[PDB]
Symmetry: D2
Subunit: 331 residues, 4 copies
């Protein structure tokens, strides 16, 4: 029913999303349960800093979750791209926890970093889609993102799944706080919804195809805060997928312009950023939540730290359709 | 005797830079004296981590030094964007040390963060040029890069001085390590060489002029390693000053316009090489900033080459950046635009 | 209606104790409110370690709670002697939290340490009874056990209140843990039972009197576990008040005099048992402080038995200690000595 | 030439002392080199706290060195008696380093703690006299105190050796500081001397025997600060060895009275403590350094943190001679 293995597994995303969660997340009393680390959480809760080492899309899932990780656990969280992390030979110690987010679980510069980390005493955690990958083997432990065999060039379904995992992670770390308890369920009750919210984004597919007639070599993702990671990812996409040139940037430190203005990332600074383009007159594309010279794509409103999950879909849909329109093997 | 103020203060650098070190560093016996911190140092030494909070160019000085703070001190160092950091509401604590870096001292978002960090118990440090700045009042302690009064519309000299500052900051903290004195005296000496070395790069002004006639709409700077800050820096200079578009990218990550490329020996990796290959293979001419006497392109291919002195790796950025100011200035002149 | 002030304030305890908790703890919904710390708490939570600095009896309240602070908070807790700590010049830092415990607030060595810790950047907390005390001024924050004005020559009520204090201190810090609410509500409830339970022990005054006629020159108190603070406490009471000699020892470590022995169920280990055996085997009579209804000695052997209510383990010490005050008082009376 | 295996190896102490040091300590440029941890120091220098778990004499070596350890490394150092440490079930984590000082390397409550520690994630370090003892086996690493087979009931030679090891340890941790560099050599140059300084204490042996005619069931060790550990050890001795009753206590928080008044531990508080007994009139025994109703035993003056090493010898000598005079198997 879909002409590309990239396209099916963009739509796979309602399921891939829930598979990520099934069993591990308990929605009625709110207990997330990652047996993958039942053995090491104790240690992590009490650890110096958590360092995120990842690549391509996996790097963007780290950005996208950093924010909520940190709030949820109060720990120095930081996100390092493995290629770089190596060049810089960051010092790392025994108190440190090193979380590696992989789809493949085979990425070279990751594995290198993993080794470096390992031989340097740090504790290691894999966040891997793949079964019995290298990473899987060498890590002290780590979650299996439990998505479904990814088979398109692009890390489409993988992304959102990782994102969810990463969250479930942050929750399970932080599961012994009465003060967070409120915000714990919120997110969880909201996670339950995420999968069907995914389907309702996949209806804009029609309006998105539509939008692919006025576009021409370029595109800018205009994000801030939570929806920053989404901007950069959307950017990675267009490039990686459509062999056009996108560049995600942070709203207004300052011509087809995607600008996320979902409520979770609606700053005056994003505001004036758009207001500033509307006066220039080039039609920007405004992603945001139902009921708010341009065009605007709706996305149902979720708990802000899950908001990134939805907003990225239109991004995949566009990028896919930008490569259909150019007759390119998307697989 | 220059046509713009901003052009002036670029050549102010082999001087602003000297004064930034002047009397704060001893070259005979290789120690570094930063008065302001004098009563907070051993404190900063024993601390959990360092968050550097900054804006525009100040963010980049922090990036360029980030690698080296870590190296010297082994304190975890995070570089943060003033505006952004705030939006996140990152949890901050007593054990924390928050270096605030400003040329001005009055940047709005920088301040709310200084207040924020202050509100939450953290130790606050202020690295500024400006005198009386809101910052330097409310910061627990701090330093004045002390480079002069900047009259150009963006941070040229300030960047480099800030840089220098941050580095002496990084040296101060690591002064009690015997297995470092080697690379300490490595760094401090090469520091002393900096200003004159700036001068050989300023001579490179002519070549840079002529380049601007073969460059227009958007520019790719390319960097990895130490020179990955300078990439986003030139990207910013170009972006702000010359009112073109630019973007620095991490090299070897993944039609026919300019390509600045940094192949100084601190930042030469295979991926920086491949980076070039495919560009020289798409038969397009890059501009290769790199050390005097370097066959970076099998020379049969067309490409300019800007030529820079070779210094201590973590210092190189201070040089690599000048040609990119010089570039970002003349383009703005050529484009008619008043660089003040 | 008592013959000495000190005797008075012992029976003041089921009251001084109530006031120490009074309005600072909610029994319906099991949370604990300590005003003073209110703006320093989440800070104390995220901190490296806790050094408790104290003298005489105040040192012992800190010991008795040390086990339980750790348990509740998982912050590393070190108990230190004011005088000694100073002599060592222990290195202290910003991340540090230094609980100073005083009944008086003006103990000389306690102060120099508060200054010392202050001089060196550490967070300083003041747990005192006294109002206006030098301490409570200069401490960053702190609490008043708020137990009353102590007119006896040594710390009876104060100890127990201090204790209580420290515990509520320990509860406050661990209030945000869901896997603790169980033992929290365990502790807070048993706290509410404390004062009356004091009363059953004060009834034990008669028995204690008669004991003093079968006891003289030097006394061995014996303890391990929770009750190892109470050991050195009675050792001190006896030492100071009754002007005998005493010494508490950790039980089961390795001619014919008195032996106090604590066999309450918090502090019952094999080594506490063997401890007894060999003493009951040397055919000498111990005095076994322990819970009502306990065959601690196969009863055929001669030995008194003081009888104490059974409470939450970390609280037990508050009870076990009274009989030892009662002892240390009457001996001093009998010995003629003016206990004020 | 000595009538007891306890007595020989009290005198063995010049040699046992230097054997502890040979090769590992380099006296001319001042490098202490413990290959036993060449593999873990990196980690220890950077670790949360160091916890000392020991027994009998081994506990007292920890006290005796705590002081200089802490000054030399600035780390939370703490000394826990294993029996207790267990009862209290102290929480302990991955950042933590746990140093176990054993002569035997077989002590039960130690081994237990070691296990506890281990199964709780902490890093473990043995400080063991014995070759291939249990401790030896289970530790991440640890020094071999390299004394000589101890064969008397008492931990005589063992003590001082441990003490030295413990120091060499603290040094090697702290070996990368320019500010300490001064105080580093001082101690080292002073360590060189320690062994012969030992011999000159062993001449008081004559005067000590002598002193064992006025003594009678008791004895108090009166120490403060550095010489506190020595007081408690001297106390352990008399009891353990002579089946008399000693009780080491800290100077003056207030009748044959040993009071250490070596220069390293000469406080006004020790002062008034003695001055206070001289007025009572009972002849106290004053240990101190050559040239300063009582009796007084000389002990050459060493670098204060090594001072404890000497002062303990007269203590052994007395305790030995208190058990010769009572016709007790000292072996
Ligand atoms: O997602 P992996 O398997 O860890 O690899 C990371 C990245 O590796 C490369 O950068 C690819 O271009 C991406 O598809 C991918 O995001
Ligand atoms: O923090 P400072 O000293 O005011 O300067 C840093 C930046 O401040 C602002 O954010 C400017 O827009 C930037 O162009 C500038 O580089
Ligand atoms: O610290 P505080 O409140 O003055 O009281 C503790 C001790 O202070 C002094 O050191 C007294 O000599 C002790 O007997 C007393 O117990
Ligand atoms: O010194 P070890 O072998 O670790 O055992 C510790 C102690 O064990 C017991 O307590 C002995 O009585 C002592 O001889 C010894 O000091
Ligand atoms: Cl899992
Ligand atoms: Cl300065
Ligand atoms: Cl209060
Ligand atoms: Cl060794």
């Amino acid at each position: 029913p879909y002409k590309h293995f990239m396209q099916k597994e963009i739509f796979e995303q309602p399921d891939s999303a829930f598979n990520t969660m099934r069993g591990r997340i308990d929605f009625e009393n709110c207990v997330v349960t990652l047996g993958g680390l039942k053995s090491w959480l104790s240690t992590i809760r009490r650890c110096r800093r958590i360092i995120m080492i990842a690549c391509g899309t996996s790097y963007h899932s780290c950005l996208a979750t950093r924010s909520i990780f940190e709030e949820l656990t109060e720990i120095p969280v930081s996100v390092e791209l493995a290629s770089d992390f190596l060049d810089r030979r960051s010092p790392v110690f025994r108190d440190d926890t090193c979380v590696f987010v992989s789809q493949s679980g085979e990425t070279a510069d990751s594995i290198l970093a993993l080794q470096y980390c390992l031989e340097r005493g740090a504790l290691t955690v894999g966040i891997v889609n793949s079964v019995g990958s290298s990473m899987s083997r060498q890590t002290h432990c780590g979650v299996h993102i439990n998505a479904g065999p990814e088979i398109g060039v692009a890390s489409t379904k993988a992304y959102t799944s990782q994102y969810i995992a990463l969250v479930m992670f942050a929750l399970s770390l932080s599961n012994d706080s009465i003060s967070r308890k409120g915000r714990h369920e919120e997110i969880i009750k909201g996670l339950q919804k995420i999968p069907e919210q995914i389907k309702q984004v996949l209806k804009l597919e029609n309006k998105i195809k539509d939008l692919c007639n006025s576009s021409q070599k370029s595109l800018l993702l205009l994000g801030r805060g939570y929806q920053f990671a989404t901007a950069l990812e959307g950017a990675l996409k267009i490039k990686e997928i459509s062999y056009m040139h996108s560049e995600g940037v942070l709203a207004g430190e300052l011509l087809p312009i995607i600008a996320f203005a979902t409520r979770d990332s609606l700053f005056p600074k994003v505001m004036s950023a758009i207001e500033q383009v509307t006066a220039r007159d080039g039609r920007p594309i405004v992603i945001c939540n139902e009921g708010d010279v341009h065009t605007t794509l709706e996305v149902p409103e979720t708990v802000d730290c899950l908001q990134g999950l939805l907003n990225v879909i239109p991004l995949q849909l566009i990028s896919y359709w930008l490569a259909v329109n150019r007759g390119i093997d998307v697989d």
